[PDB]
Point group: D2
Chain length 420, copies 4
C-alpha cells in the first residue's frame, strides 16, 4: 500500500524506518508550506504564475535588499499572478506576503529603517513579518508597536539568528506568533556543528507550543547555479519536515538563482515524500501526552476531531474559521487528514499557510439568510473544493468542525460526515 | 507538571488530590501503584453495576426500597430455586419498590430484572424446564437472561429461539461455568450480548487455582469486544452470616472492578443472608474506591491500540467524545440513545466521565446498567413538533437532572453526543458545552 | 520446540499490550517454573508436631512465624526446636535440603507510644534463640524501627526487621519506615479495622509497589485463605486474593489461623503453593522488567550493576536459572528486585542467609556445608557445581540449558562483580 | 559522586527525557560533547590527499578508513597511496597517545555481473592486504558471492560492504544484506537511478535494517560537497552529516571533498566536529529499548554477554566497555546495542583492529606483547592495557567504573563473561 502505510502501522520507530518503501507513492496533498523569496530572478508576473503552480505558498520580500519602490512592484506582481487564477474559485490558491526586516545591524533596538519598513508593510497589507535578529521578548514588543493599530492582524515570526536568541528562546516564543530558524546567521554566530541542535530544539518547542516554525537558509543552495540539488540538500529538506517544521524556505534559490521554479518544485516533491514518512503513531501519542489539559472548547474539540479522524482514516477535517485559530489547534496534533479551512477572511486564508496541513479555502459565495444554513453551505463548499482538488471522493469519511454561534472563539462541535 | 499546570491553577490542587488523580497521571503502572492514596477520596458516582439476587432475605417491598437506595441496579431471580409463582411475586415487589421513586427523574432509579436459568443438568442442551422458565420471563417482561452452563454458540441460539419473537429485546448474558465454555469462549461471546464469569461452578469444573486466569481472560476479551462482563459468586460470601467481610473478599471485589468487570454480583449474600442491604452497601463502597484506582492512561491507550479502525460514525464519535472528556476532565458525557448502543460504545473506552444516557425506552434504561459508567435517565415528555427542539430538550433534561443530582456543577464542561436524524444508528455529533 | 512456547503463559508473556496479555491467558497453559513467592505459615497447636512440620515443609512452607501475641517463651522455644528438628530431618540429602526461616512476630506497643517492655524481653529471647526475622507489630514511624534494632543489641545485627504496617499513621509515614526497615508486612487484619475496609486494597497495592521500587521484601498477610481454617477448599474470593497478591508484586504470602489453629494446615500451604505458581506465570514480565529498569536509579555499586546485567542476559537467552554465590543474601536480593523469570539459585555457607533469602521472591537458597578448598577459585567452582547439581536434581535445570552465574572477585561479602553465561552439561 | 556539571554535559538532560519530543526540546547548544567521536570517518585518498605529510594531518583530524577509488588512477597509483597511508600511520608508532590504526578500503569500479577489471582490482586488494571492499552496484546476493569468490584463497577475512546504488539493489536489499558484511548507501548513483526526492527514504530504510541486523552501514556522497572549493560547508551539509549519525550510520564518508578538493583536512575536521555533537544528541533511551525489543532471543553466549554488558554500562554510566576480541566480533555485538560507553577493543590482530572501525563506538587497541604462559595472566595484562590506554587518552580516571567483556577460554567464539571493574 501507498503513502508509507506499512511503515505507518509499525510498532516501533526502528521497524517504521525498516518498512519505508521507495515504491510507496505519496497520495496526500503537500502539507508543509513553501516560502519563496521574491527577487530579481522571480519578480515577473509570468514567472510568479509558474512559482504558484510549482507550489509557492508564501512570498518573502527581503528588506535587506532593493527599495520600497522595488518591493511594492514585487507585491503588485505577486497579487496580479495570484488573482490570475480567481476564475476557478474551488481551485484558486491564496499566497501570503511576508516582509523580512533588515535587522538591528548593531544596537539591541529597532532600527529606524526597520520602523519605516514595518510601516511600509502595514500600508501595503502584508500578512507576516519575519523579524530579523530577535534576541529577547522586548524586540518582539518593539516590532508589534512599530506595526501600530492598523497592523494588529499581522503575524510576527521571530528569526532566531544568534546565541542570545537561542538562550532566550522561551521568552521570545511566548510573545511571538512563530519562529524562523535563520541558519545563515546562526551558523556564523554559533559553531556551525551546533546549528542542527538549535534547529531540532526550536522545532520541538514550537511543536509543543502549537506555534508555526520555519526552517530557513541553504536548503537547496547549489540550485542557485545547478538544475539539481546535492544529496545533502534533499536530505536537509526531508529532515526539516521530519523534524516537524511547518514551513520550508528558499532564499537565493528563488531570489537570485537560475532555477527558481525548479527549486520550488524540488521542495514540493521532497516535502510530499517526507510527510508520508512521518511516524504518526509515535508523533500523535507524544503530542497528545505533552499537550496540557484544557477547558477551552476549541482546544477540546480539536483533540476529539483529530482522534476521530485517525480512528476512521478520514480524508479531511473541514473546519470553519474566522481568524485561523481553530485550524491551528487542529494542526498542532499533526493529523494525517488534511485540515481544509473554510474562511471568509482573505488575510486568515493567507496566514493559515504558516500551519502545517492547513489548506485554506477563501469562501466567496453569497450568504444564506439562516446562520445554520450559511454554515452548512460553507461545509458543502469545503467538500466540493475537496472533491475538485482530489482530497475527497464519494464514500470518504470527513470530520467537520464548527461553532455554536457566529464570530471567532466559539468552535465546540465535531461531526462525522460520509461524503455524498 | 506542565501538562496539568494551567488546569491545576484553574481547578485547584484539592481537585487533583481526590479520586486518585495523582496515581492517574503517573507515567508507568508501577508509579501509578506507588501513588495510590487511602486519603484520596472518591468523588465520581459508582459506575460498576451491582446485581443482587432477590430471595427470602430480600423479597419484601420495604427491604427492596432499602436495596435500591443502597445501590442495587439489577435484580436477579435464580430459577434453580423457588417456583414461577414465587418469582412472579418477587418481580412484582421489585417493580412496586422501583415505582415508589417514579415521581421524579431525580429520585427514579430504573432496576433491570434478570432471570438466571436452572441450566441443562446432565443433558447436552436446552432443558424443558428452561424452555418453560424462559417463556415465563418473556411473559413477565424480564430485561436480561443469565443463561446457565453455556458451552457453545448453539446453546445461546437455543435460548434465543426459546424466547420467541416477543423476546427479541431481551439481553442474553452467557454464564461460563466449565472447561468447554472457557475453550469455546470466542464463539460464545460472538453470539451473546455479554458474559458472566460464574466462578462457583467454574471452581468445581476446573482446578480452583485456575479460576482467576479464566476470570481475567474473559474480562479482557469482553473489554476488547465492548461487551458487558459480570463477575459473580462468593464475592462477599462471609457477609451471609457476618456484618463485615474478610480481607480477601474486599480485595476480590476491588480486583474484579480493576480487572474490568462491568457488573459485580451478590448471590447468597442477598438471597438468603442476614445482611442483604449491608452486602449491597459494601459492594457500592468498594466499587467506587476501585474505579478511581483504575489506571486510565494505560487502559485508554491500550483500548485505542487494540480496537480496529472503524467507519461506523457512532464508534468514531464515541472515541472522539471520550478523548475530549479526558482532555478537559469533563464531569459527564450526555448521550441520546434509543437502544442503549451509543452509551455502550462510549462505555467501552472506559471514560472517567459519567455517561448520562437519555432515553425514552424504559427497557433500554434498565438494560444499560450492564455497561459500566452508564447512568440511565428515562425521558417521559411528549415529542416536540420540531425534531431539533425535541433533541435540545432531552439534552437540557440531562443537564438539569445532572445538575440537581450533583453529577454536574456550574463551570463544568460536558460532552454531548447526538445524531443527525431520528431513529437508532445515526449518532455522529460531539459537542463541548460549558455548564451555566 | 512448540510445546515450550505453549506452557507457562508464554503466548500471554509475548503480548504487545497488558490488555492482549490478559486476553491470551490460558487455563491449559501449565506452569513449569518453580514457585517463587515464599509462604509464611504461622506455627500453633495445629502445626507444632515435628511430623506435621515435615509435611508442611514438603507442601512448600518457607518461613515459620512465631506469634508472640500468644504463648510463653517456653512455648515458642519448643516451637523453634520442633521446626529445627523437622528441617534437619532432611539434611541427609544436601542437594534437596530446604532451609526454613524462623520469624518472631512481636506482641506490639498496645496503648503505649513506642517499644513495650514485653517486646524488649521477646526481642532478646529471639536473639538468644537465633531467630532470622522480626515482624515488628504496629510500626508507626522510623523511631519504632530504631527501637527494635536497639533492643536486638549487638548480637542481633544480622536479624532482618520487617515492619508491619497496621494503621493510618504507618501508611502515611510509609516512606520513612521503609527507608530504615529491611522490608514490610501489609498487616490487613488490623489495617482493615484502623482504616475503612474498602481502602485496604489501595494501601496493599501502594506498599507492594513502593517495596518493589525500593527492592525490599513485602509480605501480604491475613485472611488470605480464612475459610480453610474449617473447610477443605477455599472460596472464590480467597483464591483470587492470593493470585492478586502475587500479581501485585508481593514477595511473600502468609497463613495465620489457617496454619496455626485450623483443620487444614498442610492443605492451606498446598493451596497457596498451587495458586502462586499459576499467578507467577501470568505476570506480564515485558512491562514489569521495563518499568523496574526505568524506575531504578543509576548506580555505582558493582553488585547492583552486575545484577541488572545478569537479569537482562537471563531474559535474552531464556536462562533456566541465575546461580549466585552470596554471604549475606544481598547479591540474590539485588537479582530478585528485577523480577527475572529465571530462578535465582543462591549458594551460601551462611545458614542464616539461606533462611533469610526466602523473603525475596524467586530466590532458592542452597546451604553449602563442605569445608573451604585451599584454592579460592576452586572453592567458588565447587559451589557453582553444587548449585548446578542441586538444580538438576530438583528439576530447575537440564543438560543443554543456559544458566547465568554471578560471583565476585575476592572472598567476603560486598564484592560481586562478575556475570558468566554457562551451558549445562 | 559525579557532580552537577557531569549531568549538564553530553546532552544528558535530553538523554534522560521521557519522550522523543521532550528529548528534542532539551537539546542544548551549550551542552558540550565529552565522549570520543564514535562514528568513523572514511576519507577518499586521491590527488589532494596523497602525500605522507597531508595523510598525517588527516589522521590527526580524525580519518579512520582510507578509501581508494578504483574508478580512477591505476594499480601503481593506488599502491603508492596505500604505501603513503601506511607510512603516515606508522609515523605515530612511537607514541601510544597518537598511534591510531587506519583501515584501507578498496572501492571497485563496478559492472551484468562482476567485471574483468573488478576481478583484477579485487586481486590487487588481496595482494596489498586491504581490509575492506566497497563493492559497487551490488544488485543481488549472487553479486556478493562473485566478489567473495574473487577474493581468492588469501582474502576471506576482507570485509565486503555492498554499495546499494540503484532500484534493484534497494528492492533486493534483504538478500544482499544477508550475505554482505555491511552496506554503503551510495547516494550519488542512487540519486540518478531513482528520483532524487526518494533517496532519504532508501537511506533511512537501509540504516534501520542494518542497525536491526547488527551490521555496519556507511552513509556516503555529497555530505560536505561545497567544501571541495569552500573552507566552510553549507547549512544543509552540516545538517546532512548530523542526520546520518542520528539515523544510525556507523560510518560517514568524504569523496571529492578529500580526493580532489582544496580543503581535505578541513572536511575531515568538520565531519569529526559534527559527529561528536550528533552522537551526544542520540536518544539512547528509546534506541536501546527498540534494539532490545526487535532483537530475537539468542542462545549465543557472545550475544547474551553483549546485551548484559551494554545494560550494565547504562546502569552506571560506564566510561568504557573493554572487550577482548581476536576477530572483532565481540566488539561488533556490543556496538549493535549502541552503548553510550566507548567500546575499547583490545586485540592482537592488526587486521581486526583496522576493520572494527566499521562498527560505531569501537576504539581499537592493537596489543603486541608476547603471550603469558598462564592464560588468566595474559587476559589480565590485556585488560590493564585497555584501562591504561583509556587513562592515557582521557577516556578514564581513577574511581571510574568500566565493564569488561572476556571469554572463559582462549580462541575466538567463547565470549561469555562480563565484569564490573573499579578503576584504580
Ligand atoms: O531581494 C533581493 C534583491 C532585490 C533587488 C536587487 C537585488 C537583490 C539581490 O541581489 C538579492 C535579494 C535577495 C537575496 S535572499 O533573499 O536570498 O537573501 C539575495 O541573496 C540577493 O543577493
Ligand atoms: O432464590 C432463591 C430462593 C427462592 C425461593 C426459596 C428459597 C430460595 C433460596 O433458598 C435461595 C435462592 C437463591 C440462592 S443464590 O444466591 O444461589 O441465587 C440461594 O443460595 C438460595 O439458598
Ligand atoms: O580525478 C580523480 C583522480 C585522478 C587521479 C587519481 C585518483 C583520482 C580520484 O581518486 C578521483 C578523481 C575524480 C573523482 S570525480 O571526477 O568522480 O569527482 C573522484 O571521485 C575521485 O575519487
Ligand atoms: O477559528 P475561529 O477564528 O475561532 O473561528 C471559528 C468560528 O467560525 C464559526 O464556525 C462560524 O462563524 P461565522 O458564521 O462568523 O463565520 C463560529 O461558529 C466559530 O466560533
Ligand atoms: O444509541 P442508538 O440506539 O443508536 O440511538 C441514537 C439515536 O438517538 C438520537 O440521538 C435521537 O433520536 P430520536 O429522536 O429517534 O430519539 C438519534 O439522532 C440517534 O441515531
Ligand atoms: O551477596 P554478598 O553477601 O555480597 O556475597 C557475595 C560474595 O560471595 C562471593 O562470591 C564468594 O565469597 P566467599 O568465598 O567468601 O563465599 C564473593 O566474591 C562475593 O563478594
Ligand atoms: O571477538 P572474538 O573474535 O570472538 O574473540 C573473543 C575471544 O577473546 C577472548 O576473550 C580472549 O581470547 P585469547 O586469549 O585467545 O585472545 C576469548 O576468551 C574469547 O573467545
Ligand atoms: O536571515 C536569514 O534568513 C538567515 O540569517 O538565515
Ligand atoms: O451459576 C453461578 O452463578 C455459579 O456457578 O457461580
Ligand atoms: O498482625 C497481623 O498480621 C494483622 O493485623 O493482620
Ligand atoms: O559510488 C558512490 O559512492 C556513489 O555512487 O555515491
Ligand atoms: K533580511
Ligand atoms: K441458576
Ligand atoms: K503479633
Ligand atoms: K568507485
Ligand atoms: Mg539574517
Ligand atoms: Mg452455576
Ligand atoms: Mg495485627
Ligand atoms: Mg557509484
Amino acid at each position: 500500500q501507498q503513502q508509507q502505510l506499512p511503515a505507518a502501522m509499525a510498532d516501533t520507530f526502528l521497524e517504521h524506518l525498516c518498512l519505508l518503501d521507495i515504491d510507496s507513492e505519496p497520495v496526500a496533498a503537500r502539507s508543509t508550506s513553501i516560502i519563496a523569496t521574491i527577487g530579481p530572478a522571480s519578480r515577473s508576473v509570468e514567472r510568479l504564475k509558474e512559482m504558484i503552480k510549482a507550489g509557492m505558498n508564501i512570498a518573502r520580500l527581503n528588506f535587506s535588499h532593493g527599495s520600497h519602490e522595488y518591493h511594492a512592484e514585487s507585491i503588485a506582481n505577486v497579487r496580479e499572478a495570484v488573482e490570475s487564477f480567481a476564475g476557478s474559485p474551488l481551485s484558486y490558491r491564496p499566497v501570503a506576503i511576508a516582509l523580512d526586516t533588515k535587522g538591528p545591524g548593531s544596537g539591541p533596538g529597532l532600527s529606524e529603517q526597520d520602523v519605516r519598513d514595518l510601516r511600509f508593510g502595514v500600508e501595503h497589507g502584508v500578512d507576516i513579518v519575519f523579524a530579523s535578529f530577535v534576541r529577547k521578548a522586548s524586540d518582539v514588543a518593539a516590532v508589534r508597536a512599530a506595526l501600530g493599530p492598523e497592523g494588529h492582524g499581522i503575524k510576527i515570526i521571530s528569526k532566531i539568528e544568534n546565541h542570545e536568541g537561542v538562550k532566550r528562546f522561551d521568552e521570545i516564543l511566548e510573545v511571538s506568533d512563530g519562529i524562523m530558524v535563520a541558519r545563515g546567521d546562526l551558523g556564523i554566530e554559533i559553531p556551525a556543528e551546533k546549528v542542527f541542535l538549535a534547529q531540532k530544539m526550536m522545532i520541538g518547542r514550537c511543536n509543543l507550543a502549537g506555534k508555526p516554525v520555519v526552517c530557513a537558509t541553504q536548503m537547496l543552495e547549489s540550485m542557485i547555479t545547478k538544475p539539481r540539488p546535492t544529496r545533502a540538500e534533499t536530505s536537509d529538506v526531508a529532515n526539516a519536515v521530519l523534524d516537524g517544521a511547518d514551513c520550508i524556505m528558499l532564499s537565493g534559490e528563488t531570489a537570485k538563482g537560475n532555477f527558481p521554479v525548479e527549486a520550488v518544485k524540488m521542495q514540493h516533491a521532497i516535502a510530499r515524500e517526507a510527510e508520508a514518512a512521518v511516524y504518526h503513531r509515535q508523533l500523535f501519542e507524544e503530542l497528545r501526552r505533552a499537550a496540557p489539559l484544557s477547558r477551552d472548547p476549541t482546544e477540546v474539540t480539536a483533540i476529539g476531531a483529530v482522534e476521530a479522524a485517525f480512528k476512521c482514516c478520514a480524508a479531511a477535517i473541514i473546519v470553519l474559521t474566522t481568524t485561523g485559530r481553530s485550524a491551528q489547534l487542529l494542526s498542532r496534533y499533526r493529523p494525517r487528514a488534511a485540515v481544509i479551512a473554510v474562511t471568509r477572511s482573505a488575510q486568515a486564508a493567507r496566514q493559515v499557510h504558516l500551519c502545517r496541513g492547513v489548506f485554506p479555502l477563501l469562501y466567496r459565495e453569497p450568504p444564506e439568510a439562516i446562520w445554520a444554513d450559511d454554515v452548512d453551505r460553507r461545509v458543502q463548499f469545503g467538500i466540493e473544493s475537496g472533491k475538485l482538488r482530489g482530497f475527497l471522493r464519494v464514500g470518504d469519511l470527513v470530520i467537520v468542525v464548527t461553532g455554536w454561534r457566529p464570530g471567532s472563539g466559539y468552535t465546540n462541535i465535531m461531526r462525522v460526515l460520509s461524503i455524498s
